[PDB]
């Protein structure tokens, strides 16, 4: 039900813990602060719409960069906290916290820029991007600024060292307690790998088994992007493994890019396992069991990110993949609750 689903989604942002997690993510929050500041020349003395303003922090960054008027639109009850944060910082004459969905807000003017932090796990979980695109079409002046301006999706095959340790735990029990439990390994593999949920977990370079590849890109100014979201975002990929390891599946992550403005140097916010950890971690797609691979084993496939039929805000990923000389396989995943 939409009244329930959307209402409950916005109510999840009315609690402190999610905002604590987002604002405690210094990689994310500083990237926005600096990406906004990089665009001082387009923002100073100009007007901004903040889509999904939360506690108001990004709208405040825009005012500190010199924006004349910021419309901070927030559909959850957290807008009331944003109103107090804005006043606490001496900004209520310029930054206007507006309750409700951006889809129905009525601003007194089109704006020079939109800022929004709309990205969920696996980039598109929560399905907020459509709201930003709706706001761009309705409210952004021609040639106006979008912050960030684009997103890119990346994949790499992985050998998850933590998963390997959890599966190997059962073969270690005998040395610790004198009871052989090595026969539990197949059961543990079915439980931890055989399900069909997208798993949000932090990896490192030690887990990455081949050079990461971009498999899709989302340029927010593009008119056709809304319908691509409905049909599925993604693409084919092909890589060659660095070395021998048990292949456990794939990690999907994203980056977003802020235009460089006067500096002519764009700022990239990345969620790669090769870069500092963020609250988004990575989105892990486990195969049903490990598959041994070696140096120069080719792995290919196709990944599609779709809204789930049951809940339009729940990310589904359809994976098709081929490891080496093995048969083509498929697996259909949905975001873990």
């Amino acid at each position: 039900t939409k009244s329930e689903r959307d209402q409950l989604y916005y109510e999840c942002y009315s609690d402190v813990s999610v905002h604590e997690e987002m604002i405690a993510d210094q990689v994310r929050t500083e990237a926005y602060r600096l990406g906004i500041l990089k665009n001082w020349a387009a923002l100073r003395g100009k007007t901004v719409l903040d889509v999904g303003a939360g506690t108001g922090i990004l709208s405040i960054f825009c005012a500190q960069a010199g924006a004349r008027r910021v419309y901070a639109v927030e559909a959850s009850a957290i807008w009331q906290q944003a109103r107090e944060v804005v006043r606490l910082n001496g900004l209520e004459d310029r930054v206007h916290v507006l309750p409700g969905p951006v889809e129905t807000v009525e601003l007194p003017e089109r704006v020079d820029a939109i800022v929004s932090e709309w990205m969920g796990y696996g980039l598109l979980h929560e399905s907020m991007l459509s709201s930003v695109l709706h706001a761009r079409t309705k409210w952004l002046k021609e040639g106006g600024l979008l912050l960030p301006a684009s997103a890119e999706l990346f994949v790499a095959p992985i050998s998850d060292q933590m998963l390997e340790w959890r599966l190997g735990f059962w073969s270690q029990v005998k040395q610790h307690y004198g009871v052989d439990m090595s026969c539990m390994e197949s059961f543990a593999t079915r439980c931890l790998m055989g399900h069909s949920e997208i798993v949000v977990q932090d990896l490192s370079g030690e887990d990455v088994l081949a050079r990461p590849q971009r498999f899709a890109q989302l340029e927010l100014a593009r008119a056709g992007l809304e319908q691509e979201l409905e049909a599925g975002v993604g693409g084919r990929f092909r890589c060659s493994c660095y070395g021998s390891a048990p292949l456990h599946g794939f990690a999907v992550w994203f980056q977003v890019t802020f235009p460089g403005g006067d500096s002519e140097k764009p700022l990239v916010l990345s969620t790669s396992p090769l870069h500092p950890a963020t609250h988004w971690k990575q989105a892990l797609l486990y195969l049903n069991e490990p598959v041994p691979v070696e140096q120069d084993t080719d792995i290919s496939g196709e990944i599609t990110l779709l809204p789930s039929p049951d809940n339009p805000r729940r990310l589904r990923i359809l994976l098709r993949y081929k490891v080496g000389d093995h048969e083509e396989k498929t697996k259909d995943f949905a975001m873990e609750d």
Binding site: Y10, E21, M22, G120, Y121, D337
Partner: peptide
């Protein structure tokens, strides 16, 4: 852990 789980 719980962003957008609503």
């Amino acid at each position: 852990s719980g962003x957008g789980k609503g």
